[PDB]
Ligand binder design. Structure first.
Ligand SMILES: [Cl-]
Ligand SMILES: [Cl-]
Ligand SMILES: [Cl-]
Lengths: 469, 461
């Protein structure tokens, strides 16, 4: 037996039933999103669900709607204006609808024939985005399900170019291939190094400054040291928007050092790459136009529903030469880590069009303005300290109250994070950084106002007043 | 500037405007899907500019219309060529729900309902495969990534490579797989630093099933050639012909030689939902890892795929990098779309009874194609069929063999152009073959009978 609405009949025979079911789900979702501020940024404690059994018989539409209601009510809620803790934003309206459209036609990015109206669009759109990064006329890339895959693919190509490893692999080598990255760079570099057969220890950390920016003098020292240890450097990764503090490495200096030493220059701009849409702020990315490859994630600061990420190459032909396996448009499955892929280009393209470059410029500038308000508040309070200068709309800071022993500060900041969430409905993350627990604000929600930040500080001050501070 | 409906205001202030925009898209999609048979199975640009100023809602709706009209259309009952099905209704709705709450499978904190659900659900599915009480796995964006992760683990267990990597080995690590296995194995071998040449092909039979004798043999030969075997991959539903390797025999050989046993059940894994057909997978229960893709024969909108391990702990031991488990720590991806929502809602809506029905109807339709091919001397089967996939071709005796590829290509083009029936045309055994994948639940006997009528008319000219 099959339920009457298990599939949509292509000759209309269950139209009314399908329309009714779809409408109930759409109405539920619209009620939950237009009323998202009625739910806290994080859900009430879970209740530990028990073993799952796959049912024999079809579930009723009533059961399915209750399931959806429960999954929404139990989910994280970045649409709450007090959600200010992670690089996970509320989705653009056209990103929600773009996924509805993509799931409905259910095409496959594996090949042109399986995605005739999406494949060429993706290739053309990513050439246009590469132009915004200034990479030049040979540039292009592919969409990937997440920035970790984009980093994996960039590093795979860097490895394959340096060691000609597509067919014979790298097991024959007598010196260990190594890459350099900031001590503040993302752990997907180590995951990638493991996957690529380099091992996690192949990612050599470079000292970051007090402002969490890679130190070019230490990069030189580490490169010299690796060669002296008989290692084989092949890539430098600069990070444009570090995860914890949102800082941007000095891309032009790092790139110049990579080029002097013949190393592939990869820029992980997962977060900070969005600045290419801001006339006012994109100078921070100066030097990125010379990258050999760039990772960029519209699912972070371009508000595209997860996942949406890409890897761009200054010479797209490199994917043919040093990636694609042995056998004018190239089937995208041949030149990505994935074969079959969801049509993320639909939500990306609809969202880019709906918001426009000028809309992102507004979002980004307002993000900076809110971050600056947080910085101001932190600076004026002796008991709160910044992790360092900020380069994006992210502020990492913590209490260092001089009336408590330093040994107690982690507990203090943890208790503060919990109180802000439980009583203020304001969510900050609490990363481990420099051996301690720090608070972290990521000012992404378009509906977070100055008043939310003011309310945060009022609660922080009241908490700080408890133990005689 | 930002248009008023760019986001949904969480305090309700743009509700009417957002509702109207969403309803326009929903109405368009419903019209195109309930009228999908009005579009053929396959459809009939210059540079792209990212606009400075927001596009109008008119422009956006026209873009959606054009994208849909220009898309491949597996919902047409004549679409019978690929393992790409029309999606289940709840899978479409499940992705609407997933995108709306926009949670992140990277960590429990960022997906507090969805993470535990995924873990528990994949334990239940591992149960259907008979993998035992330590089994578990992760959802992955596609079966290629599932295969990559299984082979990464296999490599890491054999060579202790998480931290030091695999450079400086005296012997080349190698993987055995059928000559008919999926090319994601070669892509994975390349990514893993093993090289595409590390995938050693094993002979397949006339029915495109791995030959165990050839395997046992290849293993002996590789050790003789200084190579270091560490994994055997059996395929349960090969891509071109849909055949299933003899899993029990392949597995016995892998265990005799201490090799990781991976089963790529991307397509044929769905048989665990059929009491009538799951005997075909006998032996899969002993696998160290399984790849399975609900996005194929369980009708879940792409992507939806998983890798299962008989011992889930192996992911902590031989995958997770040095400092409930946050899922990002034990998958190739970090951040991931919440595929579990579409999977769970679809499984609940259709049920195992529903899939048992869909699967046996696929077999019945495939058997009708098989009978049609047997009755015609000019049409030849590739071999026996194991799943609802039939690969066949014209070998007309009144035509020189060097003209058969063109004859089959012309037939495929004609079936599509005049019949609105889509078969794929793979290269197989160095020639062009037709390939039927009988997945659309609305494909009927009448469609198959119509294809054969058209084939006969083509053959009589
Ligand atoms: Cl300070
Ligand atoms: Cl996805
Ligand atoms: Cl035959």
């Amino acid at each position: 037996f099959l339920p009457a609405t298990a599939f949509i009949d292509p000759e209309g025979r269950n139209r009314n039933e399908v329309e009714r079911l779809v409408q109930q789900v759409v109405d539920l979702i619209l009620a939950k999103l237009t009323g998202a501020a009625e739910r806290p940024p994080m859900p009430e404690t879970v209740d530990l669900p028990g073993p799952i059994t796959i049912p024999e018989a079809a579930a009723t539409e009533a059961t399915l709607l209750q399931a959806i209601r429960d999954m929404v009510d139990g989910s994280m809620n970045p649409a709450n204006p007090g959600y200010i803790g992670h690089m996970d934003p509320m989705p653009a309206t056209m990103a929600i609808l773009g996924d509805l459209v993509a799931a409905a036609v259910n095409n496959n990015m594996l090949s042109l024939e399986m995605s005739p109206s999406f494949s060429r669009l993706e290739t053309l759109l990513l050439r246009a985005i590469a132009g915004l990064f200034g990479l030049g006329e040979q540039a292009g890339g592919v969409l990937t399900s997440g920035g970790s895959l984009a980093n994996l693919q960039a590093l795979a190509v860097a490895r394959n170019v340096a060691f000609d490893s597509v067919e014979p692999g790298i097991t024959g080598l007598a010196q260990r291939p190594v890459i350099f990255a900031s001590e503040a760079a993302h752990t997907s570099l180590q995951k990638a190094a493991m996957l690529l057969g380099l091992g996690t220890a192949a990612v050599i950390p470079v000292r970051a400054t007090a402002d969490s920016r890679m130190d070019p003098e230490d990069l030189r020292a580490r490169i010299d040291q690796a060669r002296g240890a008989g290692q084989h450097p092949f890539c430098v990764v600069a990070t444009a928007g570090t995860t914890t503090t949102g800082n941007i490495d000095p891309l032009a200096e790092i790139g110049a050092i990579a080029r002097e030493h013949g190393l592939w220059f990869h820029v992980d701009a997962a977060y900070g790459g969005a600045l290419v849409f801001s006339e006012r702020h994109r100078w921070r990315l100066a030097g990125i136009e010379q990258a050999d490859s760039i990772t960029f994630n519209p699912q972070k600061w371009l508000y595209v529903a997860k996942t949406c990420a890409m890897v761009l190459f200054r010479d797209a032909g490199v994917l043919e030469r040093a990636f694609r396996i042995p056998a004018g448009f190239i089937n995208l499955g041949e030149i990505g880590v994935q074969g079959t892929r969801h049509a993320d280009v639909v939500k990306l393209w609809l969202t880019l069009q709906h918001i426009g470059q000028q809309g992102y410029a507004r979002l980004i500038d307002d993000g900076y303005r809110l971050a600056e308000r947080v910085v101001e508040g932190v600076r004026q309070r002796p008991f709160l300290r910044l992790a360092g200068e900020i380069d994006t709309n992210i502020v990492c800071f913590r209490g260092e109250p001089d009336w408590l022993p330093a040994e107690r500060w982690d507990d203090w900041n943890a208790a503060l994070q919990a109180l802000l969430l439980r009583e203020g409905k304001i969510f900050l993350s609490l990363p481990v950084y420099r051996g301690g627990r720090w608070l972290r604000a990521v000012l992404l929600n378009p509906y977070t106002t100055d008043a939310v930040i003011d309310a945060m500080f009022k609660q922080i001050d009241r908490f700080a007043g408890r133990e005689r501070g």
